[PDB]
């Protein structure tokens, strides 16, 4: 399969994001902000896809199989502790949160922390370190 056949695509378009076709698929679908180096491997093992195959080398019949497992992992036997959003503060729903949904959920966590005037929300507003860090000496680029 080292010959370049038909159906090679240099840039893929899943979850309204690009994919480098040069990469192995197990690191190529990490380009979706929401899917990382290891959630890529668990999705590409729940579907029978050989990991030495490249993103451009894949055909259309299996890229939809990849992103449907991305969209709903609990329907495809992925356990609950891979997910970046379980026990949500609004619907209590276990899900994996993806490309623009990740910015949406991060922003709603931020503003839901802002509205109650929590300390972490106020430090996120002012731009300081929110996890209790010593801001006296380091972090010289978030400030000035």
């Amino acid at each position: 399969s080292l010959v370049i056949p038909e159906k090679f695509q240099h840039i893929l378009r899943v979850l309204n994001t690009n994919i480098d076709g040069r990469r192995k698929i197990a690191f190529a679908i990490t380009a979706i902000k929401g899917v990382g180096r290891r959630y890529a491997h668990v999705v590409l093992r729940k579907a029978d896809i050989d990991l030495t195959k490249r993103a451009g080398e894949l055909t259309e019949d299996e890229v939809e199989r990849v992103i449907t497992i991305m969209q709903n992992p609990r329907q495809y036997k992925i356990p609950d502790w891979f997910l970046n959003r379980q026990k949500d503060v609004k619907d209590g729903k276990y899900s994996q949160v993806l490309a623009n949904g990740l910015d949406n959920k991060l922003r709603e966590d931020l503003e839901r922390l802002k509205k109650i005037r929590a300390h972490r929300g106020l430090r996120h507003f002012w731009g300081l370190r929110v996890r209790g860090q010593h801001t006296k000496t380091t972090g010289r680029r978030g400030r000035t």
């Binding site: 180096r37 290891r38 668990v42 093992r45 729940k46 990991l51 356990p79 891979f82």
Partner: protein
């Protein structure tokens, strides 16, 4: 003529996993395609059949040093925990994959539970590993 000791262990593990494949009863778990087998890792084991090689390694280590339990296996399959911004340390393997390799390898009668605990190799398990040593020794000719 040949033992497990007097043959190179590198291909010996790689061929004994194939013997455990040909047995066809090695009892892989349900999460074997999803997990990381140690704390000091960040990526899943790339081999689809890493459980068979791990069982081969465990059988070989039980041959070479018996009386070994789950804490001993996590001591054997330990590595450097890269703590990121902090320096690296020593971390162990996964107790569940260790105990399920042992429970599989006593599900098919190749290891045995020692009195008070620990795992020892059965005599026919020694025979199995020694014939796998014989096959990889005939592979040197």
């Amino acid at each position: 003529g040949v033992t497990v000791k007097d043959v190179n262990q590198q291909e010996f593990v790689r061929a004994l996993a194939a013997f455990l494949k040909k047995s066809g009863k090695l009892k892989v778990p349900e999460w074997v395609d999803t997990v990381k087998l140690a704390k000091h890792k960040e990526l899943a084991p790339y081999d689809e059949n890493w459980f068979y090689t791990r069982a081969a390694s465990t059988a070989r280590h039980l041959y070479l040093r018996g009386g070994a339990g789950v804490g001993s296996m996590t001591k054997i399959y330990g590595g450097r925990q890269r703590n990121g911004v902090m320096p690296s340390h020593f971390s162990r393997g996964s107790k569940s994959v260790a105990r399920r390799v042992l429970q599989a390898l006593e599900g098919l009668k190749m290891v045995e539970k020692d009195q008070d605990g620990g795992r020892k190799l059965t005599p026919q398990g020694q025979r199995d590993l020694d014939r796998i040593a014989g096959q990889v020794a005939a592979a040197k000719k």
